[PDB]
Structure 1
C-alpha cells in the first residue's frame, strides 16, 4: 500500500519538516542517505512514504505547496531539507497574502495545475495507492485556501483513495492571526466535504500538554510540531507495520466514521512523560489508557469530558497482551459509560502493532471521534459572525474576486456541521 503526504502552506510545511524529521528516523533514512535502520523491519513497508531511484536514496513522496518562497526556502535550506526531490517544491513566488481567497481563487488557483501535475506523478508512482496525508493551518492563505483546494481536486481525481487531514484549527485564547475565523470557517467547509479523516490540533492545547505534561518551560514551535508529528506517525506509518491486530487508514476510517460528514478526530499520544525524572516506566498499559483517555493530553482544544464519543481508536504499537489491551478498553468503556455514546456497543477500536516508537518500550496513538469537537466549530463559527456581521476585513477577500454569498455558505455549512454532531451527544 501507499500514501503521498501534502505540506500545504507554511505551517503545514513547517510541520512537514517535523513529520519527516521523525518518520525518517522511525525508518532509518538519513538526510539523503538510505536505510541505516537499526532493524530490518523498518524497510519492508517503507514504500508507503518513499520511492526507489538510486539505491540509497529513498525520497519522501510528499508535496510542498506554498506561495511564500522564504518558507520552503528555510525547510529546504536546513536539516533534512535536502531529501525532497526539487520536483516536489510547488512554490508560488506570488504574494502569499494571508487571504483564504487569495490562495484559493486568485493566486493559488494558478499554481494548482502545476501541483496536481505532480500529485499525479507521485500517485502513479507504483503499486497501489491508499490515500494522501495533508498538513496545514486553517488560519491563513496558503494553508486553508490553497490547501483546501488541493484536496477538492484530489477528491475528484481519486474518490477511491482516502484523505487524512491534519488541521491546525485556530486556537482559542489567542489567535496567531486576525481574520483567522475567515480563513478557517472557509477551509473547514471544504474539509467537511472532501477529506474523510481529519486530525485537528491546537497550538495551545499543545502548549498546555507540552508545558505541564512535559515540564518543558520553553516549548518552541519545533516542539509542538514535533509532538504532533509523533501522533501522525503512530497513525499511518505505524499500522503499516505488523501486529497481532493491525489496521490501516481504512479500518481506522471504516471504524471511526459513523456518518459521512467525514468527522474530525483529536489525536493523543501515549507515553508523554517529562525526560529525566518522570521516566517512571509506568507503562504496563493501564498507564497508557490512563494517559490517552484523560482530558488534558488531547491535542484538541476541547475536552472529551464535555461530550460523548462515537468512536475511538487506540492504535497501540509495542508488545502487549491482547488481553490486558482488550480488557482495559472495557473498564474504560464502563467507568465512563456516561460519555461514550450508547448506540455503539463497542465504540473503541483496539488496534495493535508490534514494533514501538524506536526508542520507547510501549506507546499507543489515540484517535478520538468525540462529539466534544462541537464546542470548537462553535467557537470558530462564533468569531466569524461577530466579525462577519460588520464585514470586518472582508474587502481583502472580495477585492480578490470572492462572493458575499461564499462566506455565508461556509459558515452555514460548517455551522450546520456543529448542529449534526450534537444529534449524537443526545
Structure 2
C-alpha cells in the first residue's frame, strides 16, 4: 500500500538514520534478531510500508546505506539493531571526498553512484507499488552534499513522477565548522529547488522567522569569499568554471526575494 524506501548518505546521515530505525522497530515490536513478538493488531496493518517480510517471519527494513569511507559502515553493523539490515545494501568507497563537493559530484561520484542505482532497483522490484523516496544527507561536508546532490539528481530522472522528501541538516548560525562551508551550501540548495517536493532543516516548500535568516547569512559570507576568489582553484581545476558559481548566487538571491519580509540630493525631484 504505497510502500516507501529510505536512503542514508554520509557520516552525519548514517548516525541519524541508525537512530531513526530505533523508533519504528520498538514501536512495532520488532525484535533485534528480526523476528516479531508483538501483542497488538495495530502494529501489523501497516508493517509492510516500512518492512519487507522474509520467509519464516524475518522482517528486514528498506534502507540503503552509501558512503565514500568504509570506516563508517561497521559502526552501524556492530551497534544495536544492526544485524537486521540487508547485507547487500551496504555501498562503500575507498577514497573519500574530503569536504569536496565537486570531487564527490563528477570526478569520483560518477563511479559509485552507478553502484547505488542497481541497488535501489532490486528493492523497488520487490515492493507492490511505491509512492516516493526518503533521503538523508548534509549541507556542509562535501562528502555527503556532493554525493547526495548527484544521488538526488539521478533518482528524479528515472522516476520523474514520484515524490521525494529530504531531511537535510543545515550549518550552524554563527560558528562555522569548516572553512569552505558557504561554498558547499550555495551550490547544493539551488539543486534542491526544482528536484525536491518537501525538505526539512534540523539544527517555497522549506520547513524547519520565515527561513529568511538562514539564506541571508550564507550569501553574506559567500559574496565576501567570492570577491577575493579565495580557495576557488580547488573547484575549477577539477572541471568547474567561473559561471557555475555565478548562477548559484544569482539563483540564491531570487529565493530571498520570494521570501519578502512584508542621497543628500533631494531638492526638486
Q: Work out whether the TM-score is over 0.5.
A: yes
Distance 1:173-1:41 versus aligned 2 partners, 3 A rule: same
Question: Could you list the per-position Cα deviations for residues 162-187 of structure 1 after superposition, in whole angstroms to 9, with x for gaps in the alignment?
Answer: 11111101121222222111111111
Q: Once the 2 structures are TM-superposed, how far is the Cα of residue 161 of structure 1 from its aligned partner?
A: 1.7
Question: Could you list the per-position Cα deviations for residues 233-263 of structure 1 after superposition, in whole angstroms to 9, with x for gaps in the alignment?
Answer: xxxxxxxxxxxxxxxxxxxxxxxxxxxxx62
Cα distance in 1 for residues equivalent to 2:221 and 2:39: 49
Give the TM-score taking structure 1 as reference length: 0.57
Distance 1:383-1:23 versus aligned 2 partners, 3 A rule: farther
Distance 1:28-1:414 versus aligned 2 partners, 3 A rule: farther
Distance 1:41-1:421 versus aligned 2 partners, 3 A rule: same
Does the CA contact (< 8 Å) of 1:50 and 1:60 recur in 2?
yes
Cα distance in 2 for residues equivalent to 1:125 and 1:381: 44
Name the SS for the 1:379 alignment partner: helix
Cα distance in 1 for residues equivalent to 2:58 and 2:97: 32
Give the TM-score taking structure 2 as reference length: 0.89
Name the SS for the 1:190 alignment partner: coil
Q: Once the 2 structures are TM-superposed, how far is the Cα of residue 38 of structure 1 from its aligned partner?
A: 4.4
Name the SS for the 2:49 alignment partner: helix
Does the CA contact (< 8 Å) of 2:96 and 2:143 recur in 1?
no
Aligned residues: 260
Name the SS for the 1:15 alignment partner: helix
Cα distance in 2 for residues equivalent to 1:32 and 1:383: 49
Distance 1:159-1:372 versus aligned 2 partners, 3 A rule: same
RMSD of aligned alpha carbons: 3.3
Structure 2: gaps spanning 5 or more residues: 263-267
Higher deviation after alignment, 104-113 or 40-49:
40-49
Distance 1:421-1:44 versus aligned 2 partners, 3 A rule: same
Does the CA contact (< 8 Å) of 2:107 and 2:238 recur in 1?
yes
Q: Once the 2 structures are TM-superposed, how far is the Cα of residue 115 of structure 1 from its aligned partner?
A: 0.6
Distance 1:43-1:400 versus aligned 2 partners, 3 A rule: farther
Distance 1:123-1:414 versus aligned 2 partners, 3 A rule: farther
Divergent runs of 4+, >6 A: 423-426
Q: Once the 2 structures are TM-superposed, how far is the Cα of residue 67 of structure 1 from its aligned partner?
A: 0.4
Does the CA contact (< 8 Å) of 1:9 and 1:141 recur in 2?
no
Q: Once the 2 structures are TM-superposed, how far is the Cα of residue 156 of structure 1 from its aligned partner?
A: 1.0
Distance 1:56-1:159 versus aligned 2 partners, 3 A rule: same
